[PDB]
Paper text:
We examined amino acids predicted to show altered (V132, H160) or neutral (V140) responses to altered amino acid side chain interactions. The removal (V132A) or addition (V132L) of a side chain methyl group of V132 was engineered to decrease and increase, respectively, the strength of hydrophobic interaction across the dimer interface. Computation predicted that these mutations would result in more negative and positive cooperativity in CAP, respectively and that the most important contacts contributing to this effect were with L62 and V132 of the opposing monomer. High-resolution X-ray crystal structures of CAP mutants V132A and V132L demonstrated that these variants possessed decreased and increased hydrophobic interactions across the dimer interface, respectively. Comparison of variant crystal structures with wild-type demonstrated that there was no statistically significant change in structure. Cooperativity for cAMP binding was studied by isothermal titration calorimetry (ITC) for wild-type, V132A, and V132L proteins to examine whether the experimentally observed changes in cooperativity matched computational predictions.
Residue numbers in the entry:
A (entry chain B): 9 to 208
B (entry chain A): 8 to 207
């Protein structure tokens, strides 16, 4: 991948342990990132710091792109390493020079913006159409259809903490706890184990 | 406008769409890029029961139908419907990609708008997640008060909007919108006069 490697030679590259914060919402946006290895969560918060994950981003993903096309913008979200990460960074100013040399690097970036918009639009859809019970139910169902969902004699089973579920739908761990109990008692799932079984 | 947009537009056909006509249908094969020369549109998606949600309004100078551009074989991710009479330039993706090669600035213009839509749709996903239906409505009326067609008034801004529209934006029924709008004007936050609302 000649264009990528060229792009990266113009970056500086650093390692970040899991749980460390790469981007703080509200900071001035002046640099672009690219994930060389690992995974990050893109997070927003309510006024009391309850979190919602807008996306996971993985190796090959650009981050910090949204301040690129107009000066004076702030980071729109927190971005937090979910595993140990290797992350390339480059100033918007140097990136813009790179685009002049070869606009393919802009194509790649824009393709990812367009995917993100489709996915975030779909999520806003579910947030409008579903209450917190439906959100959690549709999350568990989505997760059971993932390539990594394990077969179970009674349906599919998943590994996912209550806090992670809470991050997906933007509710507390305890709210998740209560609604999982309700869904168990409605005979839709079982969560009495260290994992979750979605029936059917 | 500038010589670059005019260059781009001379490679487009201009089509007219009457108010309430659909420009783009969800699920259609995406092979075409659009640009709004005049007028305004609504972007909509739907739940399995035919409930509609307004993801966004877009206006003169806005690109539409861009999300299929970066990868072949995609579907339209939403319906796009004329809110007023519209004049809309259109061009095939393939021909757009050729233009990008002559002058990458036209891709820059487009990517700028994608970045803005991702910021706006993320903030909206947060609203839907974190706010109760009343907070969604009170935030929506501010956002509406800075659409191109929301003009001034002694005690703040003034807008025209239906209950159905608001309900489509925040995710609730007209009836519920009616009850909340009533609450909001007791809380001396607005005054309503038919379909026209003054936002303080
Ligand atoms: N809805 C989203 N989906 C995926 N990534 C996002 C989303 N919102 C923000 N981001 C990423 O989080 C970053 C926060 O900083 P920026 O606003 O500079 O750029 C942002 C994007 O790279
Ligand atoms: N969240 C959004 N904000 C603004 N416009 C959007 C949004 N989602 C979809 N659209 C527009 O609606 C169009 C539907 O067709 P496309 O998916 O080709 O391209 C889409 C975008 O131009
Ligand atoms: N709970 C909901 N979540 C998302 N959208 C809704 C919900 N309830 C109603 N809507 C949509 O918003 C519209 C507002 O006007 P109507 O009540 O005619 O029809 C409504 C539905 O299409």
């Amino acid at each position: 991948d000649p264009t990528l490697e060229w792009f990266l030679s113009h970056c500086h590259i650093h390692k970040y342990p899991s749980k460390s914060t790469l981007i703080h919402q509200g900071e001035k946006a002046e640099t672009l990132y690219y994930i060389v290895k690992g995974s990050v969560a893109v997070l927003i918060k309510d006024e009391e710091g309850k979190e919602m994950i807008l996306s996971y981003l993985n190796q090959g993903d650009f981050i910090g792109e949204l301040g690129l096309f107009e000066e004076g913008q702030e980071r729109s979200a927190w971005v937090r390493a979910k595993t140990a990460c290797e992350v390339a960074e480059i100033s918007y100013k140097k990136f813009r020079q790179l685009i002049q040399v070869n606009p393919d690097i802009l194509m790649r970036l824009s393709a990812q913006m367009a995917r993100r918009l489709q996915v975030t639009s779909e999520k806003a859809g579910n947030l409008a159409f579903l209450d917190v019970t439906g959100r959690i139910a549709q999350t568990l169902l989505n997760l059971a259809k993932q390539p990594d969902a394990m077969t179970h004699p009674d349906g599919m089973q998943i590994k996912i903490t209550r806090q992670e579920i809470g991050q997906i739908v933007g509710c507390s761990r305890e709210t998740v706890g209560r609604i999982l109990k309700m869904l168990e008692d409605q005979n839709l799932i079982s969560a009495h184990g260290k994992t979750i079984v979605v029936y059917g």
